[PDB]
Amino acid sequence: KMRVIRVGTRKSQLARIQTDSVVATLKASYPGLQFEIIAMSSLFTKELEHALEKNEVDLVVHSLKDLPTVLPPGFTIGAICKRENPHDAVVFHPKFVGKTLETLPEKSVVGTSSLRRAAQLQRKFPHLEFRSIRGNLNTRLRKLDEQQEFSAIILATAGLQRMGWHNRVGQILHPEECMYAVGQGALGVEVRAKDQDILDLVGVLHDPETLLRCIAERAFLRHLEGGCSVPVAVHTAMKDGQLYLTGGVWSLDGSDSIQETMQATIHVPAQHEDGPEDDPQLVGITARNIPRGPQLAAQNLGISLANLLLSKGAKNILDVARQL
Ligand SMILES: *Cc1[nH]c(Cc2[nH]cc(CCC(=O)O)c2CC(=O)O)c(CCC(=O)O)c1CC(=O)O
């Protein structure tokens, strides 16, 4: 009568690397336990979810920014892992290595299929062109270097780092240039919402500071009626007992913009707990072993900033962008 922890992965390289980093952390906490990785084949979220409900697998690893602020019923995010670098990065064509976006020749084409990235970068760099680029990270790096269309592309720093492409990171974008997506750089572990055994085990992965930052960022996004699909961006930081949250929305061209910052006293809790089970998820995340007070406070900060943005016309900016 054995028990093996079954871990679902997409077989794509980056998804597989993320899965292994999490399994490695679990093995270190649970050396006496057995894990089995089950390769399978954004439809991919659906099918890995399908295997979870069909009980073919026990946990799957996502980039947090790829999960929506409300998960389908019967699933939850049981762990938010310690955040890697959240910043967007510029990769340059070999001809332009050493340059910045500030020093590219006028009318260079920058590749990105993110509405958030294009809107912010258009606003700050009027003399540049931004055009859609499709594919995974290696395919985008290929189309940048071999085809002569693009002079640069935008990618998450975290993804390049995980892929072993740290050296192609040419410039790391600051918040004044491009704020990042909600939950960028953090990994989220999705599990069956009722599965207390697996929820127990993966709970060891929660990093308190990352969990609180991502609750505030996801609550901001959810209250604005947003997902991966909208031109919304954020910056969070925890220092000296303060949780800072900057949030922004943009027209698809970046000409219209509301951006404000708010803060609150949330101390990063050092202790673990065994909170009650009937405590519901917060923005899709189950963290019963972290003190709940700081979580609720982070959720309120997100909501407060969304309300401030909405009172300055955010819903109009977002509804106008969506219809295009
Ligand atoms: C919301 C969104 N997801 C992606 C594709 C994606 N998802 C995860 C990563 C790696 C970074 C991480 O784990 O946080 C990536 C790739 C990347 O952002 O570099 C995108 C990118 C669409 C595109 O520009 O082609 C987005 C949109 C967004 O970030 O706003």
Side-chain angles (χ1 to χ4, degrees), residues 7-10 14-22 40 42-50 52 57 59-68 71-72 75-81 162 183-191 218:
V7 176
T9 187
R10 296 166 35 199
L14 168 64
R16 190 79 172 242
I17 291 187
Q18 298 176 337
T19 299
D20 291 342
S21 63
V22 169
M40 298 199 23
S42 147
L43 99 106
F44 55 84
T45 301
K46 264 283 302 178
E47 49 157 320
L48 277 147
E49 253 158 12
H50 198 93
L52 265 174
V57 73
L59 71 95
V60 309
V61 180
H62 291 99
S63 303
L64 182 50
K65 76 180 194 163
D66 291 337
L67 302 157
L71 296 179
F75 312 95
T76 188
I77 299 154
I80 302 282
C81 301
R162 291 186 184 127
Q184 181 157 295
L187 300 183
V189 180
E190 173 171 31
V191 305
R218 283 167 59 85

Side-chain angles (χ1 to χ4, degrees), residues 253-286:
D253 46 76
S255 48
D256 305 320
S257 169
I258 306 150
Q259 188 194 313
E260 306 298 336
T261 295
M262 280 204 291
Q263 69 212 87
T265 291
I266 298 117
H267 277 274
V268 186
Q271 274 173 17
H272 289 263
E273 326 199 330
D274 205 6
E277 319 77 75
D278 56 18
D279 281 335
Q281 313 174 44
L282 297 170
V283 291
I285 300 156
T286 301

Side-chain angles (χ1 to χ4, degrees), residues 63 65-66 112-114 116-117 140 155-156 162 185 228:
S63 303
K65 76 180 194 163
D66 291 337
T112 169
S113 285
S114 165
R116 155 187 77 83
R117 278 166 176 159
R140 289 178 189 207
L155 297 167
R162 291 186 184 127
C228 213

